[PDB]
Amino acid sequence: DLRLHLLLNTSVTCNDGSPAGYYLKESRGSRRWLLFLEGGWYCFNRENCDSRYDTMRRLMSSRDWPRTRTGTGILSSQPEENPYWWNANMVFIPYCSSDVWSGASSKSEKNEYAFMGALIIQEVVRELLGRGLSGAKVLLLAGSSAGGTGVLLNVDRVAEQLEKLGYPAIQVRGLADSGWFLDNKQYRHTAPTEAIRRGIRYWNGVVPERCRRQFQEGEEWNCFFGYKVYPTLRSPVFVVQWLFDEAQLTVDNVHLPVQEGLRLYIQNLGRELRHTLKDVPASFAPACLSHEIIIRSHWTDVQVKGTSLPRALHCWDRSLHPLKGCPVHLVDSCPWPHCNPSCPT
Numbered sequence: 001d002l003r004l005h006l007l008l009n010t011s012v013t014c015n016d017g018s019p020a021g022y023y024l025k026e027s028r029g030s031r032r033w034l035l036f037l038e039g040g041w042y043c044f045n046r047e048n049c050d051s052r053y054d055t056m057r058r059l060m061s062s063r064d065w066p067r068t069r070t071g072t073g074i075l076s077s078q079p080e081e082n083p084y085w086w087n088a089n090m091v092f093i094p095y096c097s098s099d100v101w102s103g104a105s106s107k108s109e110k111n112e113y114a115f116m117g118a119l120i121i122q123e124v125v126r127e128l129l130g131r132g133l134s135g136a137k138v139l140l141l142a143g144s145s146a147g148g149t150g151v152l153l154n155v156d157r158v159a160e161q162l163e164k165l166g167y168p169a170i171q172v173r174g175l176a177d178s179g180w181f182l183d184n185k186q187y188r189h190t191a192p193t194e195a196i197r198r199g200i201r202y203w204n205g206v207v208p209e210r211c212r213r214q215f216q217e218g219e220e221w222n223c224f225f226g227y228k229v230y231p232t233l234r235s236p237v238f239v240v241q242w243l244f245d246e247a248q249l250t251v252d253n254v255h256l257p258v259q260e261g262l263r264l265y266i267q268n269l270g271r272e273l274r275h276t277l278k279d280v281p282a283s284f285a286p287a288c289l290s291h292e293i294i295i296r297s298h299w300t301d302v303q304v305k306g307t308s309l310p311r312a313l314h315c316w317d318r319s320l321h322p323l324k325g326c327p328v329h330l331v332d333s334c335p336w337p338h339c340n341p342s343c344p345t
């Protein structure tokens with residue numbers, strides 16, 4: 001169980017103005033710190049945020065959060081469940097800003113909602129430095145789905161914050177799970193790129209500086225797509241992505257007797273995802289239809305080329321000190337979902 005702490009700076013808020021916060025379980029024998037960003041889609045205008053407030057209020061407000069949370073998967077403290085980092089200090093940061101962790105906007109007379117995801121991360125990091133983070137050797141910023149994209153948008157900002165605060169010994173790294181999407185041609189029409197474009201204006205969203213300077217004013221939506229923002233990052237980042245991600249297929253208007261047109265569409269999607277990962281040295285991408293993995297209790301079960309994800313992350317740790325029998329780049333080459341026998345059922 002991790003215990004809830006509301007932010008002492010109560011001007012850093014969830015969408016409705018309630019204070020944001022974090023759940024913490026300390027491990028006093030450890031110099032490793034894991035900060036996990038929750039996911040949960042987003043909203044991008046008044047009407048669609050109003051509907052989210054009716055039926056997804058815990059993703060917009062802290063008024064109804066519980067005092068504790070159980071750590072699962074990579075957040076578990078049991079070695080049987082978490083072979084990688086069971087002895088680490090564990091932090092779960094709830095997602096209550098609906099902005100893919102990019103916002104820097106307060107509630108005001110002109111703004112019904114606050115969008116402060118980027119500021120929430122920096123305030124958590126600050127307040128944690130007085131609870132033991134000042135002694136850390138490694139800070140791993142991790143996250144799933146919207147939180148995985150949040151890692152890509154924020155890991156370099158955390159690194160810069162700690163250097164300017166006077167903590168150059170802390171090594172900042174990122175782990176992005178299920179947040180690596182393609183701005184591809186859809187199977188049918190009914191678009192995420194335009195929703196993100198409008199969202200950035202609504203949230204006053206911020207993106208990493210080198211990416212912003214490449215794409216320039218008006219085109220910051222490009223930095224929400226992993227294969228475009230990743231080459232601009234300086235911190236080491238490990239990318240986890242199912243080749244046939246369910247959220248990707250949903251926005252592509254695919255719902256699973258598959259005939260030739262859809263077969264070719266699905267096979268081309270896996271090929272394109274594989275291609276975007278060829279220059280990503282630390283990555284784990286199985287040929288499965290699924291979504292998210294790192295906080296699932298059975299995350300230890302899936303393997304690529306005989307190597308589990310906990311093992312791949314351990315090999316990554318060793319590489320940041322070409323290891324024999326300890327690989328870090330693991331991408332499936334077979335072309336259809338569940339061609340890998342370790343895929344979840």
Ligand SMILES: COc1ccc2[nH]cc(CCNC(C)=O)c2c1
Pocket residue numbers: 040041042100145146147149179181182192193196224225247248251
């Ligand atoms: C799950 O919601 C998210 C989270 C992070 C994201 N980054 C970029 C996009 C838009 C394209 N992908 C989808 C699923 O629409 C996005 C959506």
Ligand SMILES: COc1ccc2[nH]cc(CCNC(C)=O)c2c1
Pocket residue numbers: 182183184185186191192193194251252
């Ligand atoms: C590749 O062909 C095209 C052509 C025109 C387009 N407009 C917008 C998109 C991106 C659509 N994908 C998602 C997931 O948002 C697009 C793609």
Ligand SMILES: *[C@@H]1O[C@H](CO)[C@@H](O)[C@H](O)[C@H]1NC(C)=O
Pocket residue numbers: 009011012119
């Ligand atoms: C609280 O957070 C806000 C938003 O980042 C910041 O402007 C302010 O300086 C913070 N308060 C203190 C006392 O540092």
